[PDB]
Design a binder for this molecule. Structure first.
Ligand SMILES: Cc1cc2nc3c(=O)[nH]c(=O)nc-3n(C[C@H](O)[C@H](O)[C@H](O)COP(=O)(O)OP(=O)(O)OC[C@H]3O[C@@H](n4cnc5c(N)ncnc54)[C@H](O)[C@@H]3O)c2cc1C
Ligand SMILES: Cc1cc2nc3c(=O)[nH]c(=O)nc-3n(C[C@H](O)[C@H](O)[C@H](O)COP(=O)(O)OP(=O)(O)OC[C@H]3O[C@@H](n4cnc5c(N)ncnc54)[C@H](O)[C@@H]3O)c2cc1C
Ligand SMILES: Cc1cc2nc3c(=O)[nH]c(=O)nc-3n(C[C@H](O)[C@H](O)[C@H](O)COP(=O)(O)OP(=O)(O)OC[C@H]3O[C@@H](n4cnc5c(N)ncnc54)[C@H](O)[C@@H]3O)c2cc1C
Ligand SMILES: Cc1cc2nc3c(=O)[nH]c(=O)nc-3n(C[C@H](O)[C@H](O)[C@H](O)COP(=O)(O)OP(=O)(O)OC[C@H]3O[C@@H](n4cnc5c(N)ncnc54)[C@H](O)[C@@H]3O)c2cc1C
Lengths: 163, 158
């Protein structure tokens, strides 16, 4: 397309746009829980309510989401750093390292580390380089009070002010 | 609707940085808007996305010229965020800005970083368009990011 910025320049830029932190979960086609830490969550539209997440091609989580067409977005509170670490690290059995429950849909809900969970139906996808944007039409939301966890400038932080 | 309100309440609790996304329209006029939907998409090549309302002046400009700038606001930039989200006309007369060599508007006083992007694709979703921006050039300085979350502005705390 033309000149591209060096990957380190891009990483430095995007490190300076802080975000909340989710764990995006699903079941694979055999019913096994899958999930990953995800900071690339944003709102797409209100009609109907649709968010998006951007997941690596070949990841276990995207494989499950693509096959089953459902996923949950678990928004982490300020007590959820360890869950974010578990779900981005090398442990082979991540759901043994967090407290979690299964909703009627089967989707994993990190009910001790997340202050909100949105259950979503996949309504579309768009491949982009090594990743895929997944559009999720929100079907159900459970939300409680909590201070959001943040990630920015290569560090965890908490949203700094009370509700 | 009630479903829409529940969704707004959810997404309000996902805080973010704040950008002003700028472009030139097909007639050369600067356009832009406040944007919190900046999202990293991939590194091959480095590509971010934004979600812009269909029919917005900024989306029309981005679509016409196939380029845009993402100006990341520092914690002194609330006023620019308000100008670029509010109803009052003549936004560019209400901020100090300069033109990059490419022509794209750079909010030099309110932003700590500016990324110049080429539009590599667009996908409509409901009444919005997801715009994929392949990043071509970045100017970045130290700065403390402005944040927006829980229906308020704040500053990155570290
Ligand atoms: C703050 C933050 C934000 C992130 N945001 C995103 C995002 O938006 N999108 C995205 O795609 N990624 C993101 N990641 C990276 C993502 O969390 C990890 O790549 C995660 O490992 C993907 O898990 P998976 O099970 O889907 O994938 P896989 O890579 O398929 O991992 C399969 C399983 O292998 C194990 N495993 C994982 N990594 C290793 C390893 N290095 N060595 C050995 N075993 C391993 C785990 O049990 C994992 O469940 C983020 C990470 C962080 C820290
Ligand atoms: C959208 C996304 C995709 C990811 N894909 C992978 C992956 O394929 N394999 C893997 O092992 N880990 C992946 N990760 C995890 C990533 O490599 C970092 O470990 C994590 O983002 C935390 O990085 P850091 O901010 O502390 O610093 P850095 O690694 O310097 O990253 C700075 C910022 O750059 C962006 N970024 C970094 N890596 C990627 C990437 N691969 N794609 C898109 N944006 C990126 C993020 O916004 C991140 O916060 C991904 C993260 C994100 C947000
Ligand atoms: C924190 C935050 C984040 C946001 N994030 C996003 C995002 O990611 N995506 C998105 O699409 N929107 C977002 N918005 C909303 C967006 O900034 C505004 O809708 C903005 O007005 C769009 O500008 P435009 O010039 O492209 O639109 P237009 O509606 O085409 O407005 C044209 C011009 O008319 C004036 N004007 C604007 N609104 C009105 C009005 N209601 N009545 C009369 N004149 C008006 C302004 O001068 C504007 O430049 C966000 C707002 C906030 C506060
Ligand atoms: C991606 C995005 C798109 C937007 N599109 C428009 C638009 O088309 N017209 C307009 O006048 N203003 C739009 N806005 C501005 C928006 O309506 C709010 O005025 C602004 O986000 C500040 O709201 P708030 O967070 O304080 O509270 P709320 O209005 O409660 O919004 C909470 C969150 O809900 C989501 N959201 C709100 N409105 C929209 C929307 N219309 N489309 C998608 N997600 C939304 C965002 O994630 C926002 O942060 C948009 C904002 C964003 C982030």
């Amino acid at each position: 397309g033309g000149v591209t910025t060096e990957q380190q320049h891009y990483r430095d830029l995007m490190s300076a746009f802080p975000t909340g932190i989710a764990v995006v979960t699903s079941l694979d086609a055999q019913g096994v829980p899958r999930g990953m830490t995800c900071s690339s969550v944003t709102s797409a539209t209100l009609s109907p309510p649709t968010l998006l997440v951007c997941l690596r091609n070949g990841s276990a989580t995207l494989d499950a989401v693509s096959a089953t067409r459902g996923f949950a977005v678990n928004l982490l509170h300020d007590g959820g750093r360890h869950a974010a670490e578990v779900f981005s690290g090398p442990d082979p059995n991540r759901f043994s390292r967090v407290q979690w429950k299964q909703c009627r849909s089967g989707l994993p809900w990190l009910s001790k580390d997340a202050f909100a969970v949105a259950e979503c139906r996949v309504s579309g996808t768009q491949e982009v380089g090594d990743h895929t944007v997944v559009f999720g039409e929100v079907a159900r939301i459970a939300q409680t009070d909590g201070t959001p966890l943040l990630y920015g400038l290569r560090s965890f932080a908490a949203w700094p002010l009370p509700s």
